[PDB]
Amino acid sequence: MNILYKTAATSTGGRDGRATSHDQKLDVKLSAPRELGGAGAEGTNPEQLFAAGYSACFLSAMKFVAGQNKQTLPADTTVTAEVGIGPNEEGGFALDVELRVALPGLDAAAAKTLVDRAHHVCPYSNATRNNVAVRLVVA
Amino acid sequence: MNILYKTAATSTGGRDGRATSHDQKLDVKLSAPRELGGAGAEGTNPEQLFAAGYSACFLSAMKFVAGQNKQTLPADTTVTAEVGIGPNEEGGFALDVELRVALPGLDAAAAKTLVDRAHHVCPYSNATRNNVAVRLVVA
After folding, report:
1. Taking CA atoms, what residue in B is nearest to A12?
2. Considering only CB atoms, which chain B residues are within 8 Å of A115?
3. What is the CATH number of the domain that holds A97?
4. Within this chain, do residues A81 and A38 fall inside the same structural domain, yes or no?
5. Widest CA span in chain B
6. Minimal Cβ distance to A26: which of B48, B54, B88
7. What domain range is B82 assigned to?
8. Are residues B138 and B85 in the same domain?
9. DSSP-derived pairing of the beta strands B133-138 and B93-102
């Protein structure tokens, strides 16, 4: 294919994990705290990292979507991904993430449908709703 | 559900994007490839963010797996997530991500099956491969 934009990232096994956009765009380390059986550090939690990233990504995704939908979204809009981890009857762990969408000037009744469609057309969103346990909660 | 541990990460659509793990675990501003259709900022690309976070998360997962499989994995290991984006035949944006699994003391031939089965039993979503075009490249 014709790759317009490409970037390589390198992620090392630091204390629990390390992540660096190798072209010097990103450089940090993450680690699940020893609360439920983690590693032992105060870095960033894994699913928390995906949540934060994805949520932030959702704004950029909608930044584009609005551009093709001929609509304009406020800059003051925010999305808060609240993630929880608990055991499942399968005997393993299970992720439950409530994606809390705050779009200013927007009604909840309308937000239900706007978030739904936005979370339907954008990548990740499909996989994270129909496949994964993300509870879409509109502000 | 019966959550054991729950965290929260908020993300505004600031300039191009913003992401802040509300527990003060993370606080940065990011940016989609404005080169193609973003908003304009000098931050981290969503594609890379997920890729790197996933790579690091995979190392954390493998760490825990080793912990329940009573085995130990070399701390010298690294995973390089190389993400690219280009216009697909469909007329949209397609992500091609070469996920490079560099595990020391391990062959390519063996790594092939190990990474295969590993990504099988614990990916992140079925759509993380079936929806997202990933090249599993073992190092």
Report:
1. B78
2. none
3. 3.30.300.20
4. no
5. 48
6. B48
7. 45-139
8. yes
9. parallel
Collect all residues of chain A within an 8 Å Cβ-Cβ radius of residue B2: 86-87
Work out how many domains chain B is built from and give that number: 2
Contact between chains at B6 and A82 (C-beta distance less than 8 A) = yes
What are the Cα distances from residue B7, in Å, to A37, A110, A124, B47? 16, 27, 20, 23
CB contact under 8 A, A45 and B25: yes
Inter-chain CB proximity B96 and A5 less than 8 Å: no
Min Cα separation A135/chain B (Å): 11
The three-class DSSP label of residue A42 is coil
- What's the full length of chain A, in residues? 139
Q: Which residue reads 């469909």 in tokens? A: B90
Phi-psi region of A124 (alpha: psi -120 to 50; beta: other; left: phi over 0): left
A-chain residues near B95 (CB < 8 A): 123
Q: Which of the residues B2, B16, B20, B21 would you substitute to probe the A interface, choosing the one with the greatest number of A C-beta atoms within 10 Å? A: B21
Residue with tokens 């900022």: B41
Task: Supply the Cα-derived Rg of chain B in whole angstroms.
Answer: 17
Method: NMR
Tell me how many degrees the CA angle A119-A96-A42 measures, rounded to the nearest 5: 110
3-state secondary structure of B120: helix
The structure tokens listed for A96 are 């439950």
Count of H helices and E strands in chain A? 3, 6
